[PDB]
Amino acid sequence: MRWENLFVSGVAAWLPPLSTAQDAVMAGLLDPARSKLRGIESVTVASDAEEDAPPRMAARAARAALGRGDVDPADVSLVLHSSLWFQGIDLWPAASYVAHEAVGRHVPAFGLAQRCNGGMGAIELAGAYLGSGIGAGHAALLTTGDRFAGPRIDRWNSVDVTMYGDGAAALVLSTRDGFARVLSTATGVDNSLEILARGDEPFAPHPVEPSPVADLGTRTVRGAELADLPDLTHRYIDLLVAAKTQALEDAGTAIEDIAHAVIPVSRRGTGHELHDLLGLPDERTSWAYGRTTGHVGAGDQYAGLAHLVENALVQPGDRVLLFGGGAGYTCTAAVVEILRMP
Amino acid sequence: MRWENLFVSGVAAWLPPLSTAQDAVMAGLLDPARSKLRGIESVTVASDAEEDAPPRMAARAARAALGRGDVDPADVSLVLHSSLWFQGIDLWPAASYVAHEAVGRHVPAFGLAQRCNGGMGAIELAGAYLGSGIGAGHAALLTTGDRFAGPRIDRWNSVDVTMYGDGAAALVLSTRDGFARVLSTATGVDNSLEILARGDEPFAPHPVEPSPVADLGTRTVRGAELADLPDLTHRYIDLLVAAKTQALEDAGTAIEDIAHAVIPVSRRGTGHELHDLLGLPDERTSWAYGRTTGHVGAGDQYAGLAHLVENALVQPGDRVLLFGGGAGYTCTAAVVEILRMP
Ligand SMILES: *SCCNC(=O)CCNC(=O)[C@H](O)C(C)(C)COP(=O)(O)OP(=O)(O)OC[C@H]1O[C@@H](n2cnc3c(N)ncnc32)[C@H](O)[C@@H]1OP(=O)(O)O
């Protein structure tokens, strides 16, 4: 999709303090071989206090993003809140709380689930909503927020390719103006790969209690065994290449003209990484940042973009690729152009 | 929102067998006074078999609805799966499963959370998406699915105003054509009421285990206390009346020209009921049906419209009000004109 009139108005993260892989190793929580392989130096870890519940961190990130963009909350016509895990209270609309605390009473709010790709997928859904004429305001607030805790989640081991960081991020879209223009978005998807996110886990009538520690790495292997697909790895590669090619093509931009790519925090640690598929070096991705925060739920792309802008690592005229990807498997990519610095 | 080119192509519900309130009374699960007051005659109840997990019930409803509209799955550009509760397997994209099984590999799929309003809210989000140019296809598949189970959920008592039913529904939208035309949608919202859905439940770092039985009636009472607003009931009434008024006038339709209203399954039992606020009699709403299914997660409106169409209880030219409402609080309403009978 080529967007004629869509902008990023503001972007911000609220992240708790850093917790080092070195301390995790010394506490016996993380095998040193694994620490070295995955290359994550630290992840962000929140206290267990109510004030650090995901919807409260999201509310803080949202207020920072709206303030930095100078967007009036009364001009926000939609709130989308994406997440991976528990928001702190069940049977309750976390999205309406985020909306209420950051924007106000009379804005439609949805919770959005597209696993790790939620932040990026939200941009397409919101962009469409803003162009439709359904609501009066010109802006949409997109938030993410998670806070991982045991027993269910072991942030250091529960996923093979990454380590979870706690925190929230926010991005404000506008059809009027912003510091960056969204030139394009594009989604590659292959829903056959959903089996890798459940493995051989049975469908249970109720959440299994007490919660065993999650092991999504073992799910992918039971999943691969079960699927019996000849081209499993090719399916992943193809959907990622389609998102990239179409986002770039619809933006009229080549990969050589991408100043920086903001990517999911994940790492194989040997062989080809995502940057090799994208066709650009490691230093032109957000990895140097991402490896200090870990995988902050659905917010890596918003957080990484905030990092670029806050540290003046881009200037007007640069184009940036925001690149998604999440279990499903769904990948939404976007090309943005820096128009001015906040 | 007046819609120039939005149609309903097919609608279906996959419902498990009914279970009577009176059998529940005799089993010591429901107080006789409550069964009489609420007037719910029966509720749908799924088996605990894996084949009745919500996303699987949703896939079958989706297949049924896609067949009734003769929609080629290659023309579906979006799947939105809305739900209230656990989908059977955690940390997994249920929407991608629904999409894969009902439509295919290469359609973007999102999970949606807007409590009981998810089904109706999804119509606006999907309408915008189809109108935007993002996907080539002309149709969106919208599903719902839930299957309630203990200890967390007591279908008979966990919500004071209704009793939960298991099952799934599906609604296929199209910008090209269908058996019904969507003339309008309108959302009223007041996010201050999110507190009623949370009560004084503290934000916990991890799901509380073992799960106690949910009591959402008590959350409302505790929430109202904490909120201490003098006009709480007026806020609720006002957003419902605003949803109603705007839907009706964007469709250029007066209330006495609405043949039927499909409403959420609930009942106070004395005093006014929603039909008084809508300004139409009880027999021109879906209550006679709804009172046999219970509140079927986010799918009451889809199911109620399916019941109308399948039993030829509406004819070409009739206009139907579909009326949402979910904790948040958000209410999305729509006026639909029947163009022909499938
Ligand atoms: S996922 C969906 C979950 N469900 C919800 O989120 C429901 C949210 N709302 C509530 O829980 C509130 O408690 C509401 C419904 C706002 C208030 O309910 P009450 O029944 O406690 O309201 P009051 O007793 O204050 O009623 C006073 C008078 O207000 C009118 N009125 C209230 N509710 C309705 C409805 N549903 N329909 C028509 N009129 C309504 C009545 O005139 C009422 O006087 P009565 O003499 O009781 O009729």
Side-chain angles (χ1 to χ4, degrees), chain B residues 115-116 161 196 220 232-233 236-237 268 270-274 276-277 295 325-327 329:
Chain B
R115 312 299 310 152
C116 312
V161 306
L196 302 187
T220 302
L232 185 85
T233 289
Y236 173 80
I237 266 52
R268 301 175 70 235
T270 41
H272 289 120
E273 298 289 351
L274 177 55
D276 294 297
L277 181 167
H295 175 57
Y329 189 102

Side-chain angles (χ1 to χ4, degrees), chain A residues 90 105 152 190-191 209 211, chain B residues 90 105 152 191 209 211:
Chain A
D90 73 352
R105 293 165 59 181
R152 189 65 180 142
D190 194 333
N191 295 315
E209 299 179 340
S211 281
Chain B
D90 77 354
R105 296 169 55 185
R152 187 67 180 147
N191 295 311
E209 294 185 343
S211 290

Side-chain angles (χ1 to χ4, degrees), chain A residues 84-98:
Chain A
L84 299 192
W85 197 59
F86 184 55
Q87 296 293 289
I89 302 173
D90 73 352
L91 297 173
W92 167 75
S96 289
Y97 174 93
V98 175

